Design a protein around this ligand. Structure first.
Ligand SMILES: O=c1cc[nH]c(=O)[nH]1
Ligand SMILES: O=c1cc[nH]c(=O)[nH]1
Ligand SMILES: O=c1cc[nH]c(=O)[nH]1
Ligand SMILES: O=c1cc[nH]c(=O)[nH]1
Ligand SMILES: O=c1cc[nH]c(=O)[nH]1
Lengths: 250, 249, 248, 250, 249, 249
């Protein structure tokens, strides 16, 4: 193997320079299945990688696991392998009242509430998306007619206290994050997720292009935990546009 | 008049919802000269304001002065008067070897080396431009014709030590900024300016739209102090910001 | 079905109080197999979970994935289900010339080079392991007679720049971490790993007991590539299982 | 010109080593009018400069514009031109109930609510005024006849949120500055202005002497809002004092 | 004299490698009295030293005074003279209701609410006790049948605001420490003291072994006042720290 | 008796409003011996107190001990008993080549290299001396013909690493303080001491007046062997602080 964690060689990518990167390893197959000639490559830890084709050119689907650390491994080793463009597709909790579950959110930049981003650039540096990648994602969403919101995302290193969840074992939230939800909301932040900050920072500061899109699974102005179903075709809207966006970026 | 610093009433804007915000008060007139019905409004401190017309729509040109603090004043007070879209036209110093004098740089987001941005959002918040504003700016660059680069800019509260300039009185730079320029360069940061961090942070965190464009007047990998410049380079970037404004009405 | 990520219930745990938390989903089965009545419970994302028994007492084995974010989810949801004791068993890179590959490292407290720990307590709070858990781990290592070092661990949010690696895509390390490995060496830090700061902080801040043990797979000073990590892993797997036995 | 922004040459200074540095470019002439043989030198951007004579010695008056960034350029470039001593005359908002409109305030040191000071010294460094300059201003105030208070100032990078003003477009103040005015009030801080922290730090950390005086145009604990008396007697009062102070620093 | 403050030489230690380090200089003798051949060494400022023998080996007892800055001088200059193990014995105020007077507290690690800590290691570094030292203290505590609590201690640079006391001159607490006791209580912190964060951090980062035991004098949450005497518990913690020293020689 | 640590009552102060605050307990009597009706008050820990008289007004002399934590206790409890003005007299190490052994340094404000100051005010707040106290001290120093320097001083929570001394057990200094002395020198910082940051911050932020004067006992740039020099230098500063106190009653 050419890399330590993913168990891949450069030949496995077959010249691919773009990668679609979900959090869940179990979604890699699902996304590769929407493209031509899907071929499984490897599965190690939380890193499941598939190869596929789009307009005759090769593309990589590869999971990152939850959080910046595992993402930082995935992106780095993938980049050592020849990928220059990364498109994250994820699930998200919306913090604005008008955003409906199922909607697609395109991230221009992220509130760095993580730790891995600091390992690539100091906090002054913006966790900003690539312009071509964001453009491709916005245009893809329009040519599909999906309810799309585009703006700032709060990217947290936890699922619970960092996203101000109170339905927990302790039931408390550290000072830093007490009332932080209503603050991001007043600041026009759309949503919470867990990988965009580190992904966006590490790419923007290393000459790599990155885009970020997610489907809403819960609205946090209403509840902390969703009940709604997951595996049908509802959040496939975000998946369809990330594949369509990948087309334009080849 | 309705606001503390700008000497303007809400009636002065005539329904205007977009402002173009140059740093230099003397360039306000030049920008207005490229639009229909340019009328001088007010001149107070570093805040020179003109009103104009684009395609039957009112537009404001108002200077901000150098730096986030006076920038934060102009924007706030222009927002109180009804402005919701801000386009900054400035001058800049390229950090990358491949970016030449005359080039047009559009800012997607900026490195926050300012203090005023902290007065609207904590440091983890991105100093990010509005997507529609950036789009129009990039699209306007194609229209006018310009060698254009798009990306991250370092927005400094100082012209000298924050941009690691050594042509100074002291000849020294504080620890935080020792070797900082070639660190920004390695991170792909394209230029140094002085207002974008404040403008972008304050707008994006307050539901206002903002965009940033600038003409390069010096390349730092070869010189510190800039050295014909504005005569054509300013007019160039100005034509772009005006064209971008058309697309945002 | 109760907890959102793990897909587990109170009942699946069978009144278990202790959980062993490796980073690798593949190591979960291996650890549970060393105990009595091993039974798979669930597998979602990077969280694969098993139940087993030590001396008639139910014990959970649940992976965390790589990093503090995924660790934090696992520990939290396990706590909702009744787990009060957490034992991490991991792999690590030694940064002291006298700690070679195959050695066992017990962490007293961690250098907090993560982000998730700050979501539970401010940086001034120590990322410290529970005393009973640490005691159990040291004693179990002596019981099998392993080469054991006890001390502080640098817990990084990245495998590469945070642990000061230059053999990368860009080859650069941000100012904060430039020369940092020499600093940790000078300060007597034993090793780099990627989950302890989050685990130890969130547990010490919430009334949970936690201990950290790791087998050395690489030494950051030496010029040597892995030889049987497999020998080291199953070795440390015995220590953590034997430690859990004392904590029930 | 010898400098990039200011449009001034060393000859323009005529051997001057003292600068009076108001915020407002329109005040430059007013200040120079209290001295002998005032002549306009230059006007560029926010930087309007005048030369005048005080007790036979050459003295520069030069505007800084609002904020630390503008101040940092002016002071740097004046220093390049030969200036060693800087006197700030400004307007301010008093925050203590006992300090009235029309009072004169001399700053010994400032709370650094700016970003430009960090470009000259870390936060732990004091934004402290030079002893001689401060002495000259205390004596001048007493020589002119004024109600004078001496102490700590809050130097903010914003007029609004950093000074906890709420009647704004957004109506909100960022966490950092929520209840901040009440805290500074409890800490004995007497006023808000916008350039002392930058000026005091960059001078004290570079062997330059700096002084800070301001006239109270508003009190944040009172409902009464003056006048024309803002730019009126109060402004004129402080201007007389700064000129009188300059006489003792030649 | 070999060192700047303590007024001691290498010879004065007689090959001692362990030091017991109380806060109060008045307590140094009492501790040394429990051991063989107690002899005063020196007394300068807040640092009063005594030498004793324990099971044949030489042992130093030396005061640090109040706070990290003085502690860092004692520990530094003692280390220069050949001291490798440091054991802190003090008195403390419990912040947890279940902790009563007469209870002993062993500190595994400390909350770094001090300043001197940062002069040895960045805030990221844990203010952690040495394992052998901690084990020894818990064993020695158990061997005298003491009610022992093991865990995290909050180490403050101040007695008043950093421990969130309002019964003061100003009656105010700075933002940082406003509501901070409730937070530490929720996080399971046992008590406040003023010297551990410095001792633990500087030792754990320089290859020196450190540990801390403390007797509870008062409780910040309990109504009941200490009896005919406060400090019965005083002599126990001293006996504990002396007994722990034995296992570490 | 009215306080927890100092062992004083308001009655002991006899309506005193100014205190002189050295670090060393032994200097307390010496400062008092230059005034009228000097009398011992109390001695607990590193807090030795004396009351004297000057022009019919009671004056307190009280030791703080080494460091901010110790100082914060003394200053707080003195303030509870009625002291409003605090004058610190100390020994110091100059870092400027132009500052010589035996020179007299008056502190306008201090670099906050401490932790205790943060317990009273956030880092943005200046550790500044009161103007009247600074004036009195400068005015007092010229009256007896001292060679005087008036400026900023670095106030460190450690004697060693924070003042960037390398002749230590470990021989190392944290990144934060590597090359820090050279940077303070370039910034115009006069000297190193260990109490002013805490004293000045807590006084300036609580409506208390404070100042500091010190005498130079070592220069960190050259090898001037410390000769009686400490004796004569201390005597001159002690005279200065008492003469300054006279002007503040
Ligand atoms: O609420 C949510 C949903 C998905 N991912 C998150 O981080 N938060
Ligand atoms: O170099 C430059 C040029 C213009 N503006 C800046 O801020 N820097
Ligand atoms: O070097 C290593 C080996 C394992 N895990 C790490 O985090 N680093
Ligand atoms: O409130 C005020 C008044 C004048 N200047 C300021 O900076 N603030
Ligand atoms: O160098 C010195 C001398 C005296 N006091 C200090 O703190 N440092």
């Amino acid at each position: 193997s050419d890399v330590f964690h993913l168990g891949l060689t450069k030949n496995d990518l077959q010249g691919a320079q773009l990668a679609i990167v979900p959090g869940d390893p179990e979604r890699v197959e699902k996304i590769a299945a929407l493209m031509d000639k899907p071929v499984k490559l490897a599965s190690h830890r939380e890193f499941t990688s598939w190869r596929a084709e789009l307009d005759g050119k090769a593309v990589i689907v590869c999971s990152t696991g939850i959080g910046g650390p595992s993402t930082s491994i995935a992106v780095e080793e993938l980049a050592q392998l020849g990928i220059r463009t990364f498109l994250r597709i994820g699930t998200t909790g919306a913090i604005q009242p008008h955003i409906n579950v199922g909607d697609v959110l395109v991230t221009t930049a992220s509130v760095r509430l993580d730790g891995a981003s600091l390992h690539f650039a100091p906090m002054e540096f913006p966790a900003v998306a690539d312009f071509a990648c964001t453009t491709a994602l916005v245009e893809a969403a329009k040519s599909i007619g999906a309810t799309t919101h585009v703006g700032v995302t709060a990217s947290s290193d936890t699922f619970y206290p960092g996203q101000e969840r109170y339905d927990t074992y302790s039931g408390r939230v550290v000072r830093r994050f007490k009332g932080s939800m209503e603050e991001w909301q007043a600041m026009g932040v759309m949503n919470y997720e867990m990988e965009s900050a580190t992904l966006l920072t590490m790419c923007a500061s290393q000459g790599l292009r990155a885009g970020m899109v997610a489907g809403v699974i819960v609205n946090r102005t209403q509840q902390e935990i969703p009940n709604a179903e997951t595996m049908k075709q509802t959040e496939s809207h975000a998946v369809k546009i990330v594949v369509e966006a990948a087309r334009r970026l080849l």
